[PDB]
Symmetry: D2
Subunit: 327 residues, 4 copies
């Protein structure tokens, strides 16, 4: 059938930075995370490396994606699918070739898939300020991130959902620890620290006769996986404008809605969340200059030059928005 052919053609660029993820969501009946995750899992022969029954994986993937909110413009299954697919490409970078095991790769991928599951569409601070049960439960510390990990794992325990049923205790335990570490790193309050470490790791870069980086201890191997997935999560600004633009309008819609919510209860309107005093263009350039670029610049210097085009794409989007700035 035609509709299926168009989907398959789109899925062909799965290993490409710039996948038409939105197009894919439209064609799979809004199951981008499921299709992309299953596709990426065959391209990596993961189902076979870990003996993952076909039906189990699909059932879990459908369930996980079902626990992403369809009423949320940004933090939904499309964003999940996108970070997953982005990490997938980052993993295949030449400077990291052969560096990670099948388990560590399965970790950064699973982590990415669940990194924002059941996201309410509001920031940690909003959850804290309203005294939400979630905030009370996690003591105001990485409330959302802890909850994401929590739901991600808990969903494994559903009927025919354990995609790690055939792993070994030694493996499940190792996978668990890595996913926790990666996801908790997606919390922006950890950004500044993650970047500092990343830089220090680039000023002690160690390559091999194969030119590929050398990762001795766990602390170094995980630190790359954290920045990797962190990079994927903050990758929309480095994608083809057509994509970046959809992400921006979606993220802003969510901030404005949070702003309305805060303006409903008379709270101070959060930054960038006020639709009556907004600078969408300014904010984007600001977000890139103080966070996105300073981060990706360090990532490029790590896998130099495997990401030269990505950084270049980012600098051009930076200007595209700039040359759109009124006052």
């Amino acid at each position: 059938t035609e509709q299926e052919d168009v989907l398959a053609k789109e899925l062909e660029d799965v290993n490409k930075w710039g996948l038409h993820v939105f197009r894919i969501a439209e064609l799979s009946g809004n199951r981008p995370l499921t299709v992309i995750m299953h596709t990426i899992f065959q391209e990596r022969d993961l189902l076979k490396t870990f003996k993952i029954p076909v039906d189990t994986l699909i059932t879990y993937l459908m369930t996980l994606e079902d626990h992403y909110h369809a009423d949320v413009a940004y933090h939904n299954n499309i964003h999940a699918a996108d970070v997953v697919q982005s990490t997938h490409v980052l993993l295949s970078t030449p400077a990291l070739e052969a560096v990670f095991t099948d388990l560590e790769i399965l970790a950064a991928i699973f982590a990415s898939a669940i990194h924002d599951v059941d996201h309410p569409g509001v920031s940690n601070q909003f959850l804290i300020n309203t005294n939400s049960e979630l905030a009370l439960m996690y003591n105001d510390s990485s409330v959302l991130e802890n909850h994401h990990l929590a739901v991600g794992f808990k969903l494994l325990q559903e009927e025919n959902c354990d995609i790690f049923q055939n792993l070994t205790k030694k493996q499940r335990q190792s996978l668990r620890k890595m996913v926790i570490d990666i996801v908790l790193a997606t919390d922006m309050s950890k950004h500044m620290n993650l970047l500092a470490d990343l830089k220090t790791m680039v000023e002690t870069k160690k390559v091999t006769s194969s030119g590929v980086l050398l990762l001795d201890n766990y602390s170094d191997r995980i630190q790359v996986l954290q920045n990797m997935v962190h990079c994927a999560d903050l990758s929309n600004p480095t994608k083809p404008l057509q994509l970046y633009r959809q992400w921006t309008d979606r993220i802003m819609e969510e901030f404005f809605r949070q702003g309305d919510r805060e303006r409903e209860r008379g709270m101070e309107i959060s930054p960038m969340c006020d639709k009556h005093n907004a600078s969408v263009e300014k904010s984007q350039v600001g977000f890139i200059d103080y966070i996105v670029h300073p981060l990706w610049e360090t990532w490029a210097d790590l896998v130099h030059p495997d990401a030269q085009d990505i950084l270049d794409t980012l600098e051009d989007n930076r200007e595209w928005y700039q040359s759109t700035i009124p006052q």
Copy 2:
């Protein structure tokens, strides 16, 4: 939003739509659009004010609005039926039922408050699927509630739990006695929305309508608690299953939504190879038959018995129901 305490010219239109709050058939879907998807917050506020519930229970307005919005925020916008619109619908419907002649001055303000509050939280945080589905899938929700009245227990837990958020305890000024009473009634009412309790509830209601004692004003006479809570439980149960009794234009909107939700479940069940639940197979659909099936075995027996209890008060509602049944009979393709 009002410039100098004076309405906005949309907020005004909302206000005029809300003049039919005491009427069966309120344009709830419009009110939802007009209020910015705040049908639950505005209809609850309207009802609390009219029934003078804020002064009687010393509920500060800010706390009420904040809670309401918080409660409404916890209904799922991505759910076609079990959302804030259905909640607002059930609240306003119970509100109209409470005002019936046959029950005039029968319930105390605390019982009224419980019927309305229970209506507002009755389906909060509904995931869009049934109890059976959560059970067969091994959801944590089902395990927590040991597969018994899973959703109903969860709705209650969430409804009360939300009272604890910043400036959300609308019952802060009720004495412990008032709170323990309110709470038991609200729990008794919401658990009674579970369909598995349907038959027994109806049976006791018929049994009541039989031994039914009345007058002093021609109004119903309720002795003990078992009787009063039983009536209130059926009252909210009737409001929850009242869509088939509303004007056809409303009823069909409700049907599309529940059917959509039923199909989405059928789809999700199928994807997993699970036995497809009744009415859920969007491929072997019999919408027209479903409604007739639903009206003859559940809705009509219920409202007929309810019409008996408060007769003649509910004649028009029973008629509209009987009339909506025929209409669906026609629609049945042969």
Copy 3:
């Protein structure tokens, strides 16, 4: 080897109604629940029947036992060990010989060992009056019973404790529903109905040619397991005096402690919980007349005459107490 030989001998009375359960508590190292369970399981060959790895089984029993409060005088591991063994003997009752299946038997025994796990030492009403988290979670309905179940299961997910790992998706669903049905039947507010139904069923009792009780549908089969475990839980007044008295003292200590707790908070003091207006004896007689006797009078009916010595001990034990009531 000194107290061990002594413990083995003591277990020779496992299928006997009146086990010196307390000795087994000392001799076993405060593991009455773990040992009685390990023995009973091997006997009914439940380990081989459901392929229960000796490891897991013991590991769950230990996780479960540890989850019984050692500070609580009554509702603890000894009581749970008592109920499991009392239930055991009841299942081996002749009039019921060959009625229940290996799966139903496992339920009954499992339901018993967890029927009171993690009991706080206070009644549901106390938890309800204080707006305890547990009561808010279960809506003031069977608060402790719901909790008992929830911990019974969740504790399976611990480390190598999932005993029912070698059962089918069909078995596990049956057991689960049976365990839940049983445990929730122990809630006293359910007592009246369970008795009325048990009696109504004794009125329409039916057997096969061999005289084996004929339990047709699920309603009947579970209603018998429910009341059975209910009789076990309410069996201390039917045990030899020497036992009954230790139990009565232990529950009164718990009642009084709850009473002191209510007194400190200016709360109304529950019945039997006021050590200043106590009638410990009048209470035992009252308890036996309105509840224990009517329940046991009917169970003896159903298993005529398997339980007669039991019933007789009950009427005798009531007398010993009645003679202690002053005035």
Copy 4:
């Protein structure tokens, strides 16, 4: 209503004992017996009255006592060390440390309230086993808190959670700013009691001492929140690791209790077939040797540092520690 928070017929002796509430070395075990096992309720009540916290934060007396009894009720009576007596001890020690001359007028009342409240809940609902044990069994606890500071996150959650039981919200009259400020501090303080953070906590304290500043009055100058909370964290951390600095008669009771708990875990660890944790093997126990090690590598380095920060205020405390160290030294059987 009663004098010291609870009812007691030995009130006289309890009264004389509580007179030493401002002194290092309080007979906490004796107060625990005289109070009817209510050491935490009585000592907290005494401290709040003494520091005039009820009036300053408009805390109703009945709400304070109700909360205190609830909190105390949630420490396990079957745990030899991490119980309500330890909680009471740590509270009273923090109270003494807050009164040190070098810190006079340095902390606000809200910071004082936070440090004391944090101390009272710091180990609430302790199971009697380490985080490692909870992690190596995949316990629901070790899973809710992604293996990071399991017990500490749980102590905080339960402590704050109990504020929601009937008449237990002792912070009901503080403003939103005060409640948010208090909460963060309490949270920062209790997480810091995790031993896994000791070394880093100690380093930062040394950095502070090395660059120690004093005001016109010989009291510590603490500008930013970071230095403020840091002092408070080390302060409660010191109080938690203060038993080796109390009169030997007290230290020895604490050592017997802590070891009895370590051995309860050692047993359980070999039952489930696990690697016995340090100091938990009751067959190869070097108790005296352990104390010497604990003092040498943890307690002494920590108190010597606190002592420099408040020099010479803690000279006697540091002296008693050293005497207790040498005492166990002479007990070690070679």
